[PDB]
Amino acid sequence: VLSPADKTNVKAAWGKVGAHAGEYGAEALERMFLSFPTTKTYFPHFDLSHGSAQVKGHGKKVADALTNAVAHVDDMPNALSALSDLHAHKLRVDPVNFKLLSHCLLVTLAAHLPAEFTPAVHASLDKFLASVSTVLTSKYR
Amino acid sequence: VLSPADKTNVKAAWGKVGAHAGEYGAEALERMFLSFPTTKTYFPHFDLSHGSAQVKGHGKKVADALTNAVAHVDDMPNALSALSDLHAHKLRVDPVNFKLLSHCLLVTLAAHLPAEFTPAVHASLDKFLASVSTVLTSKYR
Amino acid sequence: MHLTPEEKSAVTALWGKVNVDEVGGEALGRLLVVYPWTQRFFESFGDLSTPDAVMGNPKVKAHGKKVLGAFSDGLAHLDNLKGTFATLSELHCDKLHVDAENFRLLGNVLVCVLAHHFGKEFTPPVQAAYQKVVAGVANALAHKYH
Amino acid sequence: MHLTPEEKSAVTALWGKVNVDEVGGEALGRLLVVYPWTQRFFESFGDLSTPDAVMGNPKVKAHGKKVLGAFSDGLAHLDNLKGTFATLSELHCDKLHVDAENFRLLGNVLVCVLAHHFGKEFTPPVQAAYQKVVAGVANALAHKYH
Numbered sequence: 274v275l276s277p278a279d280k281t282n283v284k285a286a287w288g289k290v291g292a293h294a295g296e297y298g299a300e301a302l303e304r305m306f307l308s309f310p311t312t313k314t315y316f317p318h319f320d321l322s323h324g325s326a327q328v329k330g331h332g333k334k335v336a337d338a339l340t341n342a343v344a345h346v347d348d349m350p351n352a353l354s355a356l357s358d359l360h361a362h363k364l365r366v367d368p369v370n371f372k373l374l375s376h377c378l379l380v381t382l383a384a385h386l387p388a389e390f391t392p393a394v395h396a397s398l399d400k401f402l403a404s405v406s407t408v409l410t411s412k413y414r
Numbered sequence: 415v416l417s418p419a420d421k422t423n424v425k426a427a428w429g430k431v432g433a434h435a436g437e438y439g440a441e442a443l444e445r446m447f448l449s450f451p452t453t454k455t456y457f458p459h460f461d462l463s464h465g466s467a468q469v470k471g472h473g474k475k476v477a478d479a480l481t482n483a484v485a486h487v488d489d490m491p492n493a494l495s496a497l498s499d500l501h502a503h504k505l506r507v508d509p510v511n512f513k514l515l516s517h518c519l520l521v522t523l524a525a526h527l528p529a530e531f532t533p534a535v536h537a538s539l540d541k542f543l544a545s546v547s548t549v550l551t552s553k554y555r
Numbered sequence: 556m557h558l559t560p561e562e563k564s565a566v567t568a569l570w571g572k573v574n575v576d577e578v579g580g581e582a583l584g585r586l587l588v589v590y591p592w593t594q595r596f597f598e599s600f601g602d603l604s605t606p607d608a609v610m611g612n613p614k615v616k617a618h619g620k621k622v623l624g625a626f627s628d629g630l631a632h633l634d635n636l637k638g639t640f641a642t643l644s645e646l647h648c649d650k651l652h653v654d655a656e657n658f659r660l661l662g663n664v665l666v667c668v669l670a671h672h673f674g675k676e677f678t679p680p681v682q683a684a685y686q687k688v689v690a691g692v693a694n695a696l697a698h699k700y701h
Numbered sequence: 702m703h704l705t706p707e708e709k710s711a712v713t714a715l716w717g718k719v720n721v722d723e724v725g726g727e728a729l730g731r732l733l734v735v736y737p738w739t740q741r742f743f744e745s746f747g748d749l750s751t752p753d754a755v756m757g758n759p760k761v762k763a764h765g766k767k768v769l770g771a772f773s774d775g776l777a778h779l780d781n782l783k784g785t786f787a788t789l790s791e792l793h794c795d796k797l798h799v800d801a802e803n804f805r806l807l808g809n810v811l812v813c814v815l816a817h818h819f820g821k822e823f824t825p826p827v828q829a830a831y832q833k834v835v836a837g838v839a840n841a842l843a844h845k846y847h
């Protein structure tokens with residue numbers, strides 16, 4: 274579970290992201306597509322070329338959902354219900370991919386928040402992302 | 415989340431195991447050591463040779479814990495707290511290993527309960543071993 | 556592969572006793588039942604609403620046999636699974652858009668099906684050799700992913 | 702290890718700028734902090750009770766450098782990781798009893814560490830190349846496990 278300390282770390286780190294969340298969401302996706310090409314099998318309908326608007330468009334929706342989870346850190350199961358149903362019943366994204374995107378989001382944050390990305394915050398962000406993945410995968414079967 | 419049908423399925427399948435739980439436990443361990451040699455790193459103090467008394471014993475302990483989990487499928491978290499603590503704070507087994515033992519447990523059940531190991535039961539057992547795994551790795555960090 | 560002649564012989568010897576028809580249908584069927592998210596690729600096969608609808612589906616059974624068949628040929632080319640599955644790899648990637656992780660799910664389901672069928676005969680050592688083959692196969696099928 | 706000429710150039714060029722002293726200790730420390738169960742291997746290192754106790758531990762710092770030095774050598778032999786890492790693989794298995802999964806956890810932490818240090822210079826394509834390398838090294842360190 275997320276400790277009070279964990280919650281503080283996340284709010285502060287996400288806090289700093291601010292208005293760049295969407296740009297960071299886009300970048301995380303891009304890093305994921307490049308490092309783990311199997312993930313692209315889920316976006317066959319997308320232009321995955323560099324600077325694709327589709328990717329920019331999608332990165333923002335992903336960032337918004339994370340921004341929403343931070344906002345409702347104490348009720349994540351409910352705040353993300355909808356996204357969980359969608360991923361489980363419509364998209365049917367294999368669960369391993371959540372870990373790949375999480376990893377890419379950490380790298381993205383690390384690359385942009387040098388001062389904030391401390392060992393303790395890095396641990397809190399990992400646990401957080403793991404919690405979000407867990408929720409989004411809870412209604413799979 | 416285990417459905418009532420899953421719960422039924424498990425109780426039914428495990429009911430059939432009966433006095434053989436311990437043997438199935440020792441066989442599942444044996445299959446994991448053999449199939450996934452990295453799992454052996456956790457038992458440097460054991461004689462891992464075929465028919466080892468240590469392996470036989472340990473087989474019984476795991477099988478017994480599973481039995482207790484079936485009995486309290488409604489309250490696993492509490493039925494398994496101590497075990498979650500041991501694994502999380504004492505043994506500190508990497509979480510990936512749980513999936514390997516689970517798989518070997520299914521393999522063993524399949525080979526011993528041909529009539530009972532139906533597609534619906536296989537899925538329930540799979541979900542069950544996954545819930546058990548979740549509980550046991552829940553206090554890791 | 557990194558199969559010992561002994562492991563090679565174990566795999567091969569058991570395979571000889573395999574009823575491809577029954578095993579292929581069962582392996583594909585359990586895949587769709589156990590990991591329902593894999594049904595996303597077989598929408599056109601029909602009603603997969605239930606275990607029973609899935610196991611009885613002839614399209615599932617027939618495709619399972621086509622799948623175990625390819626598997627069989629790979630067992631005939633264990634020293635070059637890569638070259639044997641190159642065409643099938645690009646198809647699964649470029650045409651089918653199938654997450655390569657599904658190859659691993661299927662491999663494990665297969666092991667469970669061999670255990671179910673062969674019982675006592677599917678020993679820890681035989682299982683160990685088959686774990687290596689399924690991993691090999693799964694890697695070969697994902698090799699041309701880009 | 703499908704390192705294209707360009708991936709290899711990319712890996713190497715960046716590695717040119719790394720202070721192995723530094724990065725080694727950050728990566729090892731971060732491991733012990735993010736995945737606390739990994740502390741199991743180092744109870745002889747003293748206090749690992751808090752992030753500061755871990756990150757500033759002279760023992761973690763010195764061990765990390767030893768590790769990055771070993772890693773550094775693998776980068777000079779991208780051609781032969783298995784041979785390069787064989788005696789270390791055997792050591793970690795047989796004498797240290799280190800679960801091989803630990804090598805992939807470290808690889809990921811190292812990637813976060815390179816990102817942390819290089820900022821914008823650790824581009825998506827550079828990450829992809831490093832991803833291939835740490836998997837390569839993890840596999841070479843696990844090669845002799847039995």
Ligand code: HEM
Nearest residue numbers: 312315316334335338339356364366370371374405406409
């Ligand atoms: C923490 C992780 C994730 C979050 C927060 C997230 C969130 C979202 C959101 C907000 C949407 C848009 C839904 C809408 O139309 O309103 C979406 C769609 C989608 N997601 Fe995720 N997702 C996550 C993980 C993943 C992963 C790991 C994959 C696959 C590699 C994935 C694949 C997809 C796909 C294919 C769509 C539909 C896109 C389209 O057709 O426009 N998601 N997700």
Ligand code: HEM
Nearest residue numbers: 453456457475476479480497505507511512515546547550
């Ligand atoms: C289904 C999941 C599991 C269950 C129910 C389980 C159950 C148990 C039980 C009942 C014990 C003995 C506690 C006692 O001595 O009172 C134990 C100990 C232990 N477990 Fe697990 N375990 C599971 C998974 C794992 C896995 C996956 C590993 C590592 C690969 C592991 C490693 C160990 C070790 C090393 C010990 C101590 C053995 C000894 O020193 O005697 N466990 N476990």
Ligand code: HEM
Nearest residue numbers: 593596597618621622625626643651653657658661692696
């Ligand atoms: C060992 C693993 C596998 C092997 C050897 C294999 C082999 C094959 C073969 C031989 C075909 C024939 C298609 C053609 O020639 O046009 C095929 C098609 C296909 N495969 Fe696989 N496959 C494997 C795993 C999977 C998995 C796990 C999935 C998804 C869960 C998958 C999805 C598909 C689909 C959707 C088709 C198209 C069938 C159709 O045309 O309706 N494959 N596969």
Ligand code: HEM
Nearest residue numbers: 739742743745767768771772789797799803804807838842
């Ligand atoms: C890139 C991966 C790694 C490399 C290149 C590496 C390299 C090394 C080297 C060069 C040594 C010293 C050998 C000796 O004492 O003769 C060592 C020792 C050791 N390694 Fe690793 N290692 C790696 C990953 C790990 C991981 C992930 C762990 C556990 C989390 C680990 C556990 C150990 C331990 C416990 C020792 C001995 C510590 C002591 O002196 O008390 N290694 N490793």
